[PDB]
């Protein structure tokens, strides 16, 4: 649900972040451009530095992440 | 201190340029040059360290960072 979502994170179904190539590390700020005002529909939750959304919009967090070199990680919800 | 200018680069293959993440690290509050991909100061009393930079293009990628002085403020 679009709503719930957005508007309070829940009833999400995809949790996804951008990762360095080879550490696999978290990279907030790379998810964080790529999230909340900047992908319409997306929740940003800023404690975990994850980007959340019911609708499936992985392909296109996929391209902003990949756009900075980076991998994406995803949990289903 | 003078002007540095950088790229943010690949920790791979010679170390290309990966010029979305030096545009994400620029915006630092510098500006970006879209033919030769560096991120040069505003002013020269406006700079940024190569130190500062280096933090930045961590923030967006694996990424390491190729610095120089700015010719335009030597």
Same mark, same amino acid.
């Given at each position: 649900n679009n709503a719930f979502c957005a508007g309070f994170g829940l009833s /999400?179904?995809?949790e996804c972040w951008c990762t360095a190539h080879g550490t696999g590390n978290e990279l907030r700020y790379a998810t964080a451009a790529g999230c909340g005002d900047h992908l319409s529909k997306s929740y940003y939750?800023? *404690?975990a530095g994850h980007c959340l959304f019911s609708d499936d919009? *992985?392909?296109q967090f996929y391209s902003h992440c990949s756009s900075?070199?980076?991998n994406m990680s995803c949990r289903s919800l | 201190p003078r002007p540095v200018m950088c790229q943010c680069v690949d920790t791979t293959n010679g170390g290309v340029r990966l010029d979305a993440v030096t545009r994400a690290? /620029?915006?630092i509050d510098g500006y970006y040059t879209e033919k030769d991909g560096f991120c040069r100061a505003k002013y020269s009393w406006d700079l940024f360290t190569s130190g @500062?930079?280096? @933090?930045? /293009?961590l923030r967006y990628s694996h990424?390491?960072?190729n610095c120089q002085p700015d010719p335009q403020y030597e």
């Open positions: /999400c179904k995809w939750d800023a *404690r919009l *992985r392909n900075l070199n980076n | 690290a /620029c915006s @500062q930079f280096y @933090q930045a /293009c990424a390491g960072t």
